Ligand binder design. Structure first.
Ligand SMILES: COc1ccc2c(c1)c(CC(=O)O)c(C)n2C(=O)c1ccc(Cl)cc1
Ligand SMILES: COc1ccc2c(c1)c(CC(=O)O)c(C)n2C(=O)c1ccc(Cl)cc1
Length: 260
């Protein structure tokens, strides 16, 4: 079993690397000054944003809005590709596969968003750019309040100091939650999570031997993930009631209508 769990961990990590182009490792190298990667253009005001458009591949709050959207959709596409590699996932009832993805993708998105963040801002455009926390906070209501909750989580979450091999199993654990609403066959989902949970436990113990109860502390973080989703959805509802001229991407619209 112990050798089997390591096999499971290595399998998931390999799938993770194959599925997510911008890893935490790449993100850290960019954010700290490493020579393996190159420096981002920093956007911190209106003119940096204007010049950033020239360097990086009508209202700005709207443009930034539309930017996250395309990125979220892309992320959903990646997380979906990853889930199919989770042993057992494709063998589940198709309705359950959908349900697991529906409630799971945003929790993974915010998890992985933490990798691209520090207390000062977030990587964008596959790491070419960097948007500051304060520029985001300064955006007009309600747009200014969207990102700050993510930062506060990311700051707390990044203190756990997980690397990608850690995250690979954790996101796998998130997808295979037996307590999602509407699931038909909970039992096969829980059997897969049991093994995934076992593998996370051993992975965290071997990769972080000195940080006690990291497993427990990491599982407790799923609480914070939920509140991020709940709060976000409510802020989105304000947008739809106010900006009747724009809409969510169909895929995003399906994920959200009607989650909770
Ligand atoms: C990756 O997490 C985010 C962050 C912001 C998001 C989204 C997702 C989505 C998509 C989603 O909810 O998955 C939309 C549609 N966002 C916005 O409109 C928005 C509003 C204000 C600002 Cl300052 C920035 C973006
Ligand atoms: C999910 O987290 C975020 C937050 C902000 C983002 C993005 C992602 C992306 C997508 C990405 O990160 O690749 C873009 C593109 N964001 C912009 O604010 C932006 C910058 C310049 C222009 Cl012209 C328009 C929008």
């Amino acid at each position: 079993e112990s050798a089997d769990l390591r096999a499971l961990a290595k399998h998931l990590y390999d799938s993770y690397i194959k599925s997510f182009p911008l890893t935490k490792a790449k993100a850290r190298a960019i954010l700290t000054g490493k020579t393996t990667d190159k420096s981002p253009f920093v956007i911190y005001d209106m003119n940096s944003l204007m010049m950033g458009e020239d360097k990086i591949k009508k209202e700005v709050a709207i443009r930034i809005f539309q930017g996250c959207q395309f990125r979220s959709v892309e992320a959903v596409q990646e997380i979906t590709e990853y889930a199919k590699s989770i042993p057992g996932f494709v063998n589940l009832d198709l309705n359950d596969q959908v349900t697991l993805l529906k409630y799971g993708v945003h929790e993974i998105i915010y998890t992985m968003l933490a990798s691209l963040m520090n207390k000062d801002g977030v990587l964008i455009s596959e790491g070419q750019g960097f948007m500051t926390r304060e520029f985001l906070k300064s955006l007009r209501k309600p747009f200014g309040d969207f990102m700050e909750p993510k930062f506060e989580f990311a700051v707390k979450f990044n203190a756990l100091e997980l690397d990608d091999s850690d995250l690979a199993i954790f996101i796998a654990v998130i997808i295979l939650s037996g307590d999602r609403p509407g699931l038909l066959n909970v039992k096969p989902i829980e059997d897969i999570q049991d093994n995934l949970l076992q593998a996370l436990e051993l992975q965290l113990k071997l990769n972080h031997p000195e940080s006690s109860q990291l497993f427990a502390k990491l599982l407790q973080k799923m609480t914070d993930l939920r509140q991020i989703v709940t709060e976000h959805v409510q802020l989105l509802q304000v947008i739809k009631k106010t900006e009747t001229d724009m809409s969510l991407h169909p895929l995003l619209q399906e994920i959200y209508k009607d989650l909770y």
